[PDB]
Design a protein around this ligand. Structure first.
Ligand code: 4UR
Lengths: 352, 351
């Protein structure tokens, strides 16, 4: 997944070979200082003594990880001893503490202690106020890319600002950029709401909610189709064509309708299963044999996919009010398969 | 992102709460025996001694990974002290060493030493012979799934048996299972080759390559289109409809043709860019282009091509249906590369 190592590999960068930092000092891995000597062989001697073998200037990714956590433990020790930094650290969460270790590695302890007013707002949990003040910082001007991510990590307490670099978040990002953000927002005279308005006027029907509903069950659909006792498949929305990767690509959204009246109305729904999860389920079934180890990993990817997808949809105004994510267990507590048509009927009743 | 910890998390399993093994002994993490005492609080105190805090039976993934690396360090010390295992371990690279340590975690140090013939070919770096020899063992019979992944690690020296849940290899897996293998092979009387044969007969044209060409540039298409001075867009292939997660999904392929004849013939090509890389590039540009991210871009870009190419060749339904073209968007001079000249050169070679 995502942790402090992957975060600082983004902001600082990883080097499996010896390099020089901004002050010309020999360094390796993620900002692990070897020596202040201009001698390259003296830097190799310290590198060999730190790992236990004559690496001759090249180390493994695992060895670079075992150097980095030592520097994290050593940086925490100094943070706890520094009187200007320990009260902010003690009241911060681990994700925000990891963000607090981030600027420590970049500018040092004295530089982080310079932001006396921003640390005091983080200590008081005023996440929005210290986000605005770090934007005005000189550290923001020198590194505009890195300042935003540490700010958002302090403001949200999540790994959102570091994009999609693991398997789960990347499935949501490709889902988002390649389909949701691409085809649903109104662009030119076309878009999701436009297609639904043309659909409602053509068939004289009413959509229960004017959003694309995405089903994210923990298990793929039985027989690969949406199984329901009161929901039937209807004519899809008119296909919209969008140039994508050299193809005038057709994008189609399926439409289903309740076979039973709710409040005297037949409700339609533009909806679909979360097909990335289906492609993930299919890929996993071909490589692994459904052990308890895989079920935990599948559910872990399953949850992270929804959380990152829901975060991407909310942060972008073009898609904030266009998608409805429904994540659920395919079986109820009694063990029976959940009827998505019943879920939609109940949702329509709970507001009308 | 795959390593020995994530490998044993696949094969053996990670439990963050104190549990009891097959012999009724309290265990934590990935098979870390805590104590043989029936006292649960004795297991909690022993776990507190190993972690360094009042866990009371529950630990985090980082603590369990740190505890697992200690168990690996102890297993390596035992392997180096074993005269039967030390020579092969010294000769093996880091990845193949993890496959050896995987077996020690499963059957113990004395069990791995019995593979005398098997350890010899590994020491002499005969990977294919060692992979065949290991498949004959009883260890392959009791636990076949775990053995095949360890044997492939000995055979290839990579993490290809386990790394399907990494970003690049995972996006290639979704790209392969959810699109390439889904819609290109021939189902009933439909598929890519059928659409291309219908296309050649309707328009009386000839495809230069009887495959779907997937362009993998290191940079997004300019204005989202394929730029070329000798390629031009033609009528696309007829759209194929496949039911997919409740949607009658359309699968359409664009067709391009060479603007100039190659020995009197105009050659057509079904081709498109790699949509997982386009989304990845779009996401990288939103979250700027420092050297840290430029190396990470090329890293995922390279790993996506290699794992997608492996999946295409592994399955016979797709082995001769896809043509992957990975290339730098600019030459050394800095000029933009015309993808059509690459295809014209491909055509001029055997025609
Ligand atoms: N109802 C509806 N949903 C659509 C349509 N097009 C896409 N979706 C969704 O967007 C996701 C991203 O697809 P992508 O084109 O950006 O790359 C995909 C994906 O990486 C991989 C597996 O697809 P899937 O798991 O179903 O995720 C896709 C889907 O959920 O293969 C790529 N892929 C799938 N189809 C194509 C295609 N025609 N051309 C190129 N790449 C494809 C839609 O039209 N309707």
């Amino acid at each position: 997944g995502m942790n402090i190592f992957e975060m600082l590999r983004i902001d600082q960068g990883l080097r499996l070979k010896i390099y020089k930092d901004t002050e010309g000092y020999y360094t390796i891995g993620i900002g692990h200082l070897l020596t202040k000597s201009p001698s390259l062989n003296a830097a190799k001697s310290e590198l060999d003594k730190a790992i236990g073998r004559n690496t001759n200037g090249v180390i493994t990714k695992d060895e670079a990880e075992k150097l980095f956590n030592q520097d994290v433990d050593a940086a925490v020790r100094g943070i706890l001893r520094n009187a200007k930094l320990k009260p902010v650290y003690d009241s911060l969460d681990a994700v925000r503490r990891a963000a607090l270790i981030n600027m420590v590695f970049q500018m040092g302890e004295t530089g982080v202690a310079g932001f006396t007013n921003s640390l005091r707002m983080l200590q008081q949990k005023r996440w929005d106020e210290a986000a605005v003040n770090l934007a005005k910082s000189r550290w923001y001007n020198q590194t505009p890319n890195r300042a935003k991510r540490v700010i958002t990590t302090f403001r949200t307490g999540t790994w959102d600002a570091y994009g999609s670099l693991d398997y789960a978040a990347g499935m949501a990002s490709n889902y988002f950029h390649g389909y949701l953000k691409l085809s649903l927002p109104e662009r030119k005279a076309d878009g999701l709401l436009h297609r639904m308005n043309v659909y409602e006027d053509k068939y004289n029907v009413t959509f229960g909610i004017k959003r694309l509903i995405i089903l994210i069950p923990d298990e793929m659909f039985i027989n690969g189709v949406i199984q329901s006792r009161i929901l039937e498949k209807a004519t899809p929305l008119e296909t919209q064509f969008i140039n994508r990767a050299g193809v005038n690509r057709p994008f189609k959204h399926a439409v289903y309708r309740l076979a039973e009246k709710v409040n005297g109305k037949t409700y339609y729904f533009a909806m679909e299963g979360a097909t990335p999860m289906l492609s993930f389920f299919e890929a996993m079934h071909s490589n692994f044999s459904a052990t308890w180890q895989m079920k935990e990993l599948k559910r872990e990817i399953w949850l992270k996919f929804y959380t990152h997808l829901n975060e991407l949809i909310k942060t972008w105004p073009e898609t904030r009010n266009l998608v409805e994510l429904i994540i659920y267990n395919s079986h109820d507590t009694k063990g029976d398969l959940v009827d998505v048509g019943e879920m939609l009927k109940s949702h329509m009743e709970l507001k009308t």
